[PDB]
Write a protein that binds this DNA or RNA. Structure first.
Ligand SMILES: Nc1ncnc2c1ncn2[C@@H]1O[C@H](COP(=O)(O)OP(=O)(O)OP(O)(O)=S)[C@@H](O)[C@H]1O
Ligand SMILES: Nc1ncnc2c1ncn2[C@@H]1O[C@H](COP(=O)(O)OP(=O)(O)O)[C@@H](O)[C@H]1O
Ligand SMILES: [Mg+2]
Ligand SMILES: [Mg+2]
Ligand SMILES: [Zn+2]
Ligand SMILES: [Zn+2]
Ligand SMILES: [Zn+2]
Lengths: 619, 660, 14, 386, 233
DNA sequence: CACACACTCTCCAATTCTCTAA
DNA sequence: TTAGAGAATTGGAGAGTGTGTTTTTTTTTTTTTTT
């Protein structure tokens, strides 16, 4: 076997070897040697190689060699990788051969779909676009291993092209086989394969012209890392995919812009080519207490320790919620308690008990309701902002759309699962629309049985509504029921009702104007947003329990609430149901989470009772 | 049914020996080891089946069970050797290593071999690579440290106090080293019983998935040797030469150097400078490539007619032809789809017997530095002593030496004697007396007799094993003459008996491999320079060299300019350059083969523009064209006689080749 | 006659 | 002739999104909702071909249920030619290819659902009705098809699950932590325990008190729910007259009285239970709908909530908030217990032996005790009498 | 001083000079060969100017770069509806507004084969879209026939962008809808005219056969027509 | 159906080869 | 060693067996969920 070797290839392999093993880059540290040790620890086989590190070494010569002829240099890079990984520790390869995947990222320049040229084929790019469609994770043949039908000889490590290429000859000089083999699926090596359909970004599209699309192939660990809609920054080799129908396949036939011809395997048919990216790395650009603590850096641990040991932590948190909104301490406290939530308990009989807290900020049209909603949607994770105007065809909850079969369209109440659904203009959405969320707000599920489709969908969301009073301006002469078009079944599912009014006060307007103009000119929060987020995440790990005296205090407070809410000659409660008792429990748990204490004291229950009472004494 | 019963017994033995997670020796472990040894020996030579080895490799016995035995014995041996049933715990490794060397024995297939052996050779050569793959990567390959214990136990006692039995133990352990490192990928034996289709062999990678070319190269072997201290073992074994430890050792330390060149030893971001130079060279050749491609697409449709003699209107396409008429003529030439038939042709460890010049095994810089001093230490320790030890054996059993002995001995000798001289040339810290001991009269006459005997039997491989040594004979004679009567007795017997052998091989070997042709040009270049300091006659030895087949075999090497190096072209061109004025025999150089190669040379697609090869060649070709014009202008018939071969008629032989 | 222990010690590679 | 083994309670449960190449030819326990279901086609088990050129018998090759049996060169002669099966000694096995789809519960919100085809071999056919949610344990195999390779342009294979067991999780999604392929299957000891506790005096009171254990009071509601859960005997006089044998319950009351929680409990407890709410349940989704099959292009009939809950319970939360023209669609299936469809040339009468348990809400949100029942609800006599 | 390649040569400048009137007529009649020789003359003239003026520069860099000529204003604004079939392979000036533009279509220019038995690789230039694959390995030590397999991603590709030009509304007859023609843009001018732009395009009106059956070599006798753009203004 | 493609089955004279020629 | 008489083999055209198309989802009803 005489094989000529491209000396440039082995030179690049050796240079890559020294770069990998002795880079030693702010104290000196062999980052890539530690990367290989990291791979040995968790068996993962993705080497995230920064391109700047490769460029600084070898004064950019190796970087250019990679960036110009990546496709031909890749096998030599893999061999150089195998050398180093075996040298440091042979803990690789019931032996299971390990296939490696070199990942290059942080390229100096980022191209786009419009800037695709066929002169960059076989080179590293950094294409960025918005993913619109992703296929399934199918396994593609990588290194086949055939067994011929007679003499049972094994032909192995058959490299696969875009076709289903199989060996043509048998190594044993007694087997007649030119087209007959039986692939050994167990011995063969397969690779995850996904095809994403990215397109030009909105801001990069010239006016009038339709967006240009591309088909990017994802292989290995980079599969399912680019969901539709997310703008990702792919990077990898750009290849061209021929029409394998013309090349001839065992199961199909060629099917009918400038196609070349003349190949021995072609005959009289032509061959056409299609540009398709082959991504090697993709990034988007658009829990017990101990587990959370161990994932946090020590410097952040210090800040969290200062918070938890603080004496006035509760009031500081309340004042630090939505700093850009002046006043409204009660609404700030309610919003803070909403993020912490309760405990989503589930009883022995299988009945699920709600743990999410629902707020409704009813107020005059000039007030700051939408500011609260926007702060919450911009701060709380897994939160969405929506209005009652019902923009999309799918309602607030869900809808079925016929495909020209039926499929479920996700509503606003579902996209915010395990989060906060900031609903705006809660009065605008009609009463025939309110009946849809009666279950989604208490049972936290949406049940749909329309046509051939029947599912019980999950909506574990906390709703923060913001409803304008009927008649535009709030009328204090009537109870909260009169000023709101909501009915009793939906008004009892809201834990807290906050009424905010723009009283015609000459002095108050001065502070308001000075505050708004002051912000536009530049608010000092005792806790910054990123600083408060870790405290909320830490507090959510707590699951407070009710002490023995807490239960008695809770029962007495509920009795007082129902006694003070009694109406009619038959003593029929209207505003206060057992949902209010569960609301007191939820608010007690949220308050105890605010103080980062695992036991619920009667002080917390008294505060929760005050919070509920202030929302119903509005007469 | 017999085969599956054999598999059942192998599996039964596999679960009987024991396993992990420390390995445990099962009951009757020695009995099952002896049973396995007996079965393998019975099926190897007595029955010639080569199926038990297959079953052993299948159960991964060598990896799962055999290697852990030696690994577990290593710690006990270290504890026993450092602390201050030892016989039972020692004899257990003997059978394991005997099995290991038996499975690692290279497999040879010939015409006399039965169909089973050739059928299973392709299925067992991969397992052979698997054994050395898992052995070298097994925690720094410490099994060789256990192997050297199987030799130091016997060699510890006095050499005069050797054992008539324990002596075979040394051979058995020593064979393991040469067997593991001689493991190389085989050849895909294509079934040529029928005409092959319009497509060739898909994959020539004869490597199982667990085996990668990274983990099986000789670099891995040398790194394992250095990390396992066995360098000291190989040095101490040779340090005590003063019989049975010579023939194996001749190839134990030769296999990893059978084809590794000495140029890589000296360079003459360190690796990246050559990377940048290679990028510059490939950029230059790619720039030369694009000079033919059209500025626009292929479908632009550039059609033209060449008004050739006879007012012909032949139509050739291509906008590239519109640039130059020579491009149009080349497109005319290569348009024909008809081609002629070009005729063409290792049974011993692959090496120079089958390795092209670019097959330089990649070495780590530290590994290269270690290997630079390892061989030098071996030379400073026991090189000439080892040569003199086998001198006596080489003088006997001339016809009893199998063809393997010549290829495993002559290549070793020539490679090391060449390395010593090149190392002395680059650096003066090494004396010439370290290799001058090979000038013994008996050794020289015996190797010459072997070289001449290999000629009549058509053993071209064995003869090529001899020219590589014969080149260094003249080279060392020149070195010991310039740097200085001992050289005369070695360099005076080629008066009349040896002139025929050296002047016949170039005329006949042109129809064989490239290296066979390369040997003779070096032979002629060396012989033309060794005698230049004493002139039996300079004008008489060159007379027998100026022959038409000799020119043919020299010019046949020039056609491979896509792979010829600076020295390869330098020697071939200097052969004609040195006879331009000294011999004045340019008339036999008037074939079109040399003119077309000159056209290829000066064209940018051939030799590098930035290098130091095309400048003097271009000037000498400028003078060549002047000579051609002067000689052609004085003979109109020579215009067409330049194509036809010369004539055997008396008068014309002096009229045309000498110009009266 | 292999014990449950042998079943755990794979001999065939696969 | 053969006994198959249905492995149950596999620990590592996946989803049709998390399957990768590492799971190939290994047991998986994916979970999804059944979408399509072909008919039970007999499949060749032991193909015994007969050579046409020279021979007459070929080896009884095992069909792998995934790829066509390949004969290639004959044993009698190396020459290749046409082959066909033998009807003399051939055995068949049932074959059904159900198409799992990722359940809308487990699909990430707003994302498209993945799907894999599942092969149900003998004794497993017709065990998973379309639209039901099931957990499928089986080997995750892959077979090569030229169509997929041509479409994607890469040597990519098509995967498929050869089901080894099926457990339905539709209508018992709150029943996690249980063991076995059937939560409602009883062993002999369990049956003996049933017979032992039934002889107790006051077993009815224990059963009633054990309906909603975590819901206080409401003993009348618990009694009604228990009666509905056990049901009555469906009579059939001489084969002509048919009497309904299932009890319907209507829970009407003020908000926050655990009417929806009782319904959720009933869904958890009953064997075949379906939950549909208010406006989120159309007329044809409650009973039955016809559709043009996208592959074969003809009208086919698919059942709804009242068919998926056949011989079970159907739970309708917020009964009074459904559209009248959607609420009137359950009049026949709640008294005659049979859905009659005569649309698009499909004249047939399905069977729906359901037992509706519906939670209503009085007009104005509060039940006015001073008014009769008819004045507190918007429902009419024909639906109140059921 | 800018390192550019294309030249915005005007057609009237050939009439202005005396000896280049036949050259102008042949450019209008034989655009392909004329443009090729004009490009070669441009390259040779530039390298000669570098040699003469002694303005030191890399001769290899200039020689490697492909220099183009873009003859615009070739003639009167020919109408799309008046493209009779004697204008085949003749320079044509057209005016219109582009409807859409296909993405970049890679067309092979230099093939790249690999010897699957000795790993020998050589590049075969592609002319008129035909694959002249080597009969055997170029290396004499191997010379194995039928051992060459095309390495698609290691080849060399050019840029082709088919553009669907539309007849301008102000020139179409008021009765019928405006017609359309298909442009072809190579190696440059790609994405130089987005959809909605109005351009005056100059190119050679060319027609090619279309295969009636993909599997067979049967060719339809209708000869779909396009134009090979050489300049867009 | 049949004309064109791809390819297995099959076959003599020009191309290579070594015993007897000059 | 040379010009010339003898064996020995196998590639390039052709007999022949079996293929592969043309071949199609528009427009019109009927249903269903939103509007
Ligand atoms: N207390 C406040 N602090 C800061 N900005 C305030 C405050 N009250 C009102 N604003 C500003 O008043 C403007 C209008 O308030 P929004 O949050 O938009 O309420 P809204 O959405 O306009 O109410 P409607 O009923 O929907 S019109 C915004 O620019 C707020 O920043
Ligand atoms: N009798 C009761 N015992 C225990 N919990 C009750 C009772 N009545 C109501 N609840 C609680 O009220 C909460 C809300 O009940 P819900 O399902 O909204 O009833 P409805 O739908 O009739 O308003 C439930 O979490 C439940 O735990
Ligand atoms: Mg607003
Ligand atoms: Mg309810
Ligand atoms: Zn075979
Ligand atoms: Zn047969
Ligand atoms: Zn080759």
């Amino acid at each position: 076997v005489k094989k000529v070797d491209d000396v440039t290839g082995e030179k690049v392999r050796e240079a890559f070897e020294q770069f990998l093993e002795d880079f030693s880059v702010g104290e000196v540290e062999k980052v890539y040697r530690a990367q290989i040790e990291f791979m040995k620890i968790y068996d993962l086989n993705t080497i995230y190689i920064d391109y700047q590190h490769l460029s600084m070494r070898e004064n950019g010569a190796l970087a250019m060699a990679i960036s110009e002829q990546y496709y031909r240099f890749l096998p030599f890079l893999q061999k150089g990788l195998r050398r180093v990984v075996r040298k440091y520790a042979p803990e690789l390869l019931e032996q299971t051969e390990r296939v490696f995947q070199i990942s290059f990222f942080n390229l100096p320049t980022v191209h786009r779909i419009r800037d695709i040229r066929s002169e960059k084929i076989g080179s590293l790019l950094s294409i960025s676009g918005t993913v619109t469609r992703t296929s399934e994770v199918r396994p593609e043949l990588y290194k086949a291993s055939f067994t011929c039908d007679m003499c049972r000889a094994i032909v192995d490590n058959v490299e696969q092209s875009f076709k289903y290429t199989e060996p043509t000859f048998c190594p044993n000089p007694s087997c007649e086989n030119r087209a007959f083999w039986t692939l050994n699926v167990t011995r063969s090596r397969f690779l995850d394969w996904q095809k994403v359909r990215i397109q030009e970004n909105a801001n990069e599209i010239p006016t009038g012209s339709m967006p240009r699309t591309l088909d990017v192939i994802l292989r290995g660990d980079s599969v399912e890392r680019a969901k539709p809609g997310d703008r990702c920054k792919f990077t990898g080799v750009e290849i061209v995919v021929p029409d394998v129908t013309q090349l001839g396949l065992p199961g199909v036939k060629p099917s009918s812009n400038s196609g070349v011809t003349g190949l021995r395997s072609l005959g009289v048919r032509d061959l056409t080519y299609k540009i398709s990216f082959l991504a090697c790395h993709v990034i988007s650009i658009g829990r017990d207490q101990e587990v959370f603590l161990n994932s946090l850096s020590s410097d952040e641990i210090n800040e969290l320790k200062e918070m938890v040991k603080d004496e006035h932590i509760y009031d500081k948190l309340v004042r630090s919620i939505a700093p850009a909104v002046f006043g409204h301490e009660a609404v700030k406290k309610g919003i803070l308690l909403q993020m912490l939530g309760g405990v989503h308990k589930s009883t022995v009989e299988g009945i699920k008990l709600r743990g999410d807290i629902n707020i409704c900020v009813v107020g005059d049209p000039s007030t700051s309701k939408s500011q609260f909603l926007k702060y919450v949607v911009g701060f709380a994770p897994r939160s969405v902002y929506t209005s009652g105007k019902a923009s999309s065809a799918a309602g607030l909850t869900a809808a079925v759309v016929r495909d020209e079969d039926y499929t479920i369209e996700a509503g606003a109440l579902m996209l915010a699962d395990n989060g906060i659904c900031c609903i705006d203009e809660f009065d605008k959405m009609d009463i025939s629309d309110q009946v849809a969320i009666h279950e989604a707000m208490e049972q936290q599920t949406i049940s749909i049985a329309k046509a051939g489709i029947h599912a019980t969908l999950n909506a574990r969301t906390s709703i923060l509504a913001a409803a304008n009073p009927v008649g535009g301006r709030y009328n204090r002469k009537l109870s909260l029921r009169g000023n709101l078009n909501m009915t009793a079944p939906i008004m009892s599912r809201f834990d807290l009702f906050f009424v905010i009014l723009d009283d015609c006060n000459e002095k108050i307007d001065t502070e308001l104007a000075s505050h708004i103009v002051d912000l536009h000119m530049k608010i000092e929060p005792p806790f910054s947003a990123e600083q408060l987020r870790r405290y909320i995440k830490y507090a959510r790990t707590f699951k407070p329990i009710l002490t023995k005296e807490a239960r008695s205090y809770l029962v007495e407070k509920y009795k007082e609430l129902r006694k003070d809410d009694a109406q009619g000659f038959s003593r029929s409660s209207y505003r206060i149901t057992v949902r209010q008792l569960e609301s007191m429990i939820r608010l007690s748990e949220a308050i105890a989470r605010a103080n980062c204490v695992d036991e619920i004291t009667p002080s917390f229950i008294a505060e929760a009772y005050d919070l509920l009472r202030q929302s119903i004494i509005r007469v | 049914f017999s085969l599956t019963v054999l598999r059942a017994r192998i599996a039964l033995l596999a679960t009987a020996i024991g396993g992990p997670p420390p390995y445990k020796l099962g009951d009757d472990c020695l009995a099952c080891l002896k049973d396995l040894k007996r079965w393998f020996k019975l099926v190897d030579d007595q029955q010639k089946r080569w199926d038990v080895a297959m079953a052993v490799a299948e159960y991964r016995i060598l990896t799962d069970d055999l290697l852990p035995i030696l690994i577990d014995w290593e710690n006990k041996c270290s504890l026993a050797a450092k602390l201050a049933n030892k016989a039972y715990y020692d004899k257990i490794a003997l059978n394991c290593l005997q099995l290991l060397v038996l499975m690692t024995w290279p497999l040879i297939v010939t015409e006399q071999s039965s169909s089973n052996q050739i059928t299973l050779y392709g299925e067992l050569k991969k397992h052979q690579l698997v054994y050395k793959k898992t052995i070298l990567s097994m925690e720094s390959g410490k099994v060789l440290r256990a192997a050297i214990r199987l030799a130091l136990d016997v060699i510890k006692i006095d050499r005069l106090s050797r054992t008539p039995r324990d002596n075979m133990v040394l051979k058995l352990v020593l064979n393991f080293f040469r067997n593991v490192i001689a493991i190389e990928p085989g050849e895909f034996t294509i079934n040529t019983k029928k005409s092959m289709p319009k497509k060739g062999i898909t994959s020539i990678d004869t490597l199982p998935p667990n085996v990668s070319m990274d983990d099986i190269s000789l670099n891995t072997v040398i790194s394992s040797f250095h990390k396992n201290k066995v360098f000291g073992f190989l040095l101490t074994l040779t340090s005590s030469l003063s019989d049975f430890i010579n023939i194996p050792l001749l190839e134990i330390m030769f296999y990893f150097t059978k084809d590794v060149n000495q140029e890589l030893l000296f360079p003459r971001t360190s690796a990246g400078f050559e990377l940048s130079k290679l990028l510059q060279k490939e950029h230059q050749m790619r720039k030369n490539v694009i000079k033919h491609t059209s500025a626009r697409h292929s479908r632009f449709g550039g059609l033209l007619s060449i008004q050739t003699p006879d007012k012909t209107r032949l139509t050739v396409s291509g906008s590239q032809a519109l640039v130059d008429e020579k491009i149009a003529l080349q497109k005319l030439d290569d348009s024909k789809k008809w081609n002629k038939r070009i005729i063409k042709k290792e049974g011993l460890p692959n090496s120079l017997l089958n390795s092209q010049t670019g097959k330089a095994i990649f070495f780590t810089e530290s590994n290269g530095k270690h290997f630079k001093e390892f061989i030098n230490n071996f030379i400073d320790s026991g090189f000439n002593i080892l040569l003199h030890s086998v001198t006596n054996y080489f003088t006997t059993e001339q016809d009893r030496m199998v063809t393997l002995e010549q290829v495993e001995y002559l290549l070793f000798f020539a490679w090391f004697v060449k390395y010593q001289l090149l190392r002395s040339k680059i650096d003066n810290s090494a004396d010439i007396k370290q290799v001058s001991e090979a000038l013994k009269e008996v050794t020289f006459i015996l190797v010459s007799s072997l070289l001449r005997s290999a000629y009549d039997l058509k053993n071209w491989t064995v003869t090529h094993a001899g020219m590589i040594a014969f080149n260094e004979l003249l080279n060392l004679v020149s070195r010991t003459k310039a740097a200085q009567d001992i050289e005369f007795i070695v360099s005076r017997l080629f008066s009349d008996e040896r002139i025929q052998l050296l002047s016949n091989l170039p005329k006949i070997g042109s129809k064989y491999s490239l290296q066979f042709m390369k040997s003779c040009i070096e032979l002629t270049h060396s012989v033309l320079k060794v005698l230049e300091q004493y002139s039996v006659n300079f004008q008489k030895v060159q007379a027998n060299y100026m022959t038409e087949p000799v020119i043919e075999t020299y010019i046949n090497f020039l056609e491979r300019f896509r792979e010829l190096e600076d020295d390869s072209i330098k020697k071939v061109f200097s052969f004609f350059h040195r006879v331009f004025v000294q011999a004045k025999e340019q008339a036999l150089l008037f074939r079109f083969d040399l003119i077309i190669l000159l056209r290829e040379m000066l064209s940018p697609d051939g030799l590098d523009r930035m290098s130091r090869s095309r400048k003097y060649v271009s000037q000498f070709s400028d003078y060549f064209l002047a000579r051609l014009k002067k000689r052609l202008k004085k003979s109109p018939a020579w215009f067409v006689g330049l194509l036809f071969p010369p004539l055997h008629n008396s008068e014309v032989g002096f009229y045309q080749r000498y110009g009266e | 006659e292999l014990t449950l222990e042998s079943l755990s010690n794979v001999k065939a590679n696969s | 002739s053969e006994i198959h083994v249905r492995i149950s309670d596999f620990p590592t449960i996946y989803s049709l999104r998390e399957l990768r190449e590492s799971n190939l030819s290994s047991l998986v326990r994916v979970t999804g909702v059944v979408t399509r279901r072909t008919g039970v086609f007999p499949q060749l088990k032991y193909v015994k071909f007969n050579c046409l050129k020279c021979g007459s018998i070929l080896g009884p090759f095992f069909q792998d249920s995934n790829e066509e049996i390949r004969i290639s060169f004959c044993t009698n002669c190396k020459s290749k030619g046409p082959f066909r099966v033998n009807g003399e000694k051939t055995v068949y096995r049932n074959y059904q290819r159900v198409t799992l789809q990722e359940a809308p519960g487990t699909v990430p919100p707003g994302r498209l659902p993945r799907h894999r085809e599942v092969i149900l071999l003998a004794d497993l056919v017709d065990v998973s009705k379309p639209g039901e949610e099931v957990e499928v344990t089986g080997i995750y195999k892959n077979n090569y098809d030229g169509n997929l390779n041509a479409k994607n342009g890469f040597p990519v294979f098509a995967t498929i699950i050869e089901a080894n067991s099926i457990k339905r999780r539709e209508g018992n999604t709150a029943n996690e932590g249980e063991e076995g392929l059937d939560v409602f299957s009883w062993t002999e000891e369990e049956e003996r325990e049933f017979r032992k506790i039934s002889r107790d005096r006051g077993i009815i009171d224990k059963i009633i008190s054990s309906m909603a254990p975590s819901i206080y009071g409401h003993r009348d509601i618990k009694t009604a729910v228990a009666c509905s859960l056990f049901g009555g005997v469906p009579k059939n006089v001489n084969g002509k007259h048919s009497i309904r044998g299932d009890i319907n319950v209507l829970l009407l009351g003020d908000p926050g009285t655990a009417k929806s929680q009782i319904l959720k409990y009933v869904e958890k407890t009953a064997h075949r239970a379906v939950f549909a709410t208010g406006q989120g349940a159309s007329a044809v989704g409650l009973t039955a709908s016809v559709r043009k099959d996208p592959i074969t292009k003809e009208w086919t009939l698919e059942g709804g909530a009242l068919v998926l809950a056949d011989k079970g319970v159907c739970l309708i939360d917020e009964f009074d908030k459904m559209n009248d023209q959607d609420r009137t669609s359950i009049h026949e299936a709640m008294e005659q217990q049979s859905i009659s469809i005569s649309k698009a040339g499909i004249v047939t009468t399905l069977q729906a032996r359901c037992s509706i348990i519906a939670a209503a809400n009085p007009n104005g949100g509060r039940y006015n005790s001073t008014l009769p029942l008819a004045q507190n609800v918007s429902l009419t006599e024909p639906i109140l009498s059921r | 001083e800018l390192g550019t390649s294309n030249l915005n040569l005007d057609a009237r400048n050939l009439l202005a000079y005396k000896q280049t009137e036949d050259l102008y007529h042949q450019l209008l009649n034989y655009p392909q060969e004329v443009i090729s020789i004009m490009d070669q003359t441009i390259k040779d003239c530039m390298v000669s100017l570098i040699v003469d003026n002694n303005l030191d520069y890399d001769l290899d860099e200039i020689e490697t770069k492909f220099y183009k000529v873009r003859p615009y204003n070739v003639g009167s604004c020919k109408g799309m509806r008046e493209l009779n079939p004697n204008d085949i392979d003749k320079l044509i000036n057209l005016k219109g507004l582009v409807l859409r533009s296909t993405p970049v279509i890679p067309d092979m220019k230099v093939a790249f084969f690999k010897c699957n038995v000795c790993d020998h690789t050589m590049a075969v230039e592609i002319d008129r879209g035909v694959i002249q694959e080597p009969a055997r390995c170029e290396r004499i030590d191997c010379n194995e026939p039928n051992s060459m397999s095309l390495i698609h991603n290691r080849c060399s590709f050019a840029d082709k962008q088919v553009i669907k030009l539309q007849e301008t509304p102000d020139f179409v007859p008021d009765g019928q809808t405006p017609h359309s023609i298909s442009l072809c843009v190579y190696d440059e001018l790609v994405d130089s005219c987005r959809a909605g732009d109005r351009i005056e395009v100059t190119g050679t009106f060319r027609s090619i056969p279309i295969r009636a059956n993909s599997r067979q070599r049967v060719l339809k006798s209708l000869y779909k027509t396009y134009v090979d753009v050489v300049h867009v203004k």
